[PDB]
Amino acid sequence: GSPEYLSDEIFSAINNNLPHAYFKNLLFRLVANMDRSELSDLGTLIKDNLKR
Amino acid sequence: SPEYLSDEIFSAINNNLPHAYFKNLLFRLVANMDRSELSDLGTLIKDNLKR
Amino acid sequence: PEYLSDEIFSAINNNLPHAYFKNLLFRLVANMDRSELSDLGTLIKDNLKRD
Amino acid sequence: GSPEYLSDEIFSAINNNLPHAYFKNLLFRLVANMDRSELSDLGTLIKDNLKRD
Structure with missing residues (x-):
């Protein structure tokens, strides 16, 4: 019963x-683990993100 | 300050x-890039797509 | 980190x-503080260490 | 026979x-394909070059 989502501000503050x-x-380790x-x-x- | 982080310490981090x-x-990180x-x-991605 | 395309890497090198x-x-590692x-x-260690 | 050695000045020039x-x-293309x-x-x-000051 544990929330699967991280609020923005908490995201931004952890990364800080x-x-x-x-x-x-x-x-790198993510893209390296992809198929x-x-x-x-x-x-x-990525494609979308550049058009938006 | 390292440009690359060692495995077991990056696990320390994620952990x-x-x-x-x-x-x-x-999603998010991609959402922020340049x-x-x-x-x-x-x-x-297009490289390894063929690589 | 700039990425150098598989086609921009090949071009150059040939x-x-x-x-x-x-x-x-050795030159590189020489020219590598x-x-x-x-x-x-x-x-390399990590790369090696992998069971 | 083709050369197989390049003077430090040609290399360096060729690097700039x-x-x-x-x-x-x-x-990393080298690294990635190393056994x-x-x-x-x-x-x-790298170790050797570590303390060959």
Whole structure:
């Protein structure tokens, strides 16, 4: 029975106290752990994000 | 200050973060990046898509 | 971190000298201060350590 | 026979007209395709280069 969502302000405030580099060591290790489908899912989200 | 974080210490890091942090995490960070940043990320993705 | 496309990486390198590709790594690691050195140092370890 | 050695000045010259992001990109394409053997090689060598001040 534990909420699956992190409010913005709490997100923004946790990230303000993480080792800066973590935000690439994450994506690299994330993108590295993806498969084909995970990749187009990500490519497309990226695609959208640039058009918006 | 390292540019890369070691495995077991990055686990130390993640380990003291509630799951909520990671839920739709990929989404969020992607939500914040730059044009060249994400432009960069798109290329890698398109690369491994063929790589 | 700028990403260099699989096609922008290939292009360049084929226009690089065959001799340029000779033990680049010592030159590089030579042209790689201790800071860098340790970063990539750690990484190889991790890369290796994996059971 | 083709050369297989480049003077420190040609190398360096050839590096300055190289995109700033060539080496990091280059550095990990090598790494990524190294087996346990070469991995262990470069560590030992990074180690060696650690204290060869």
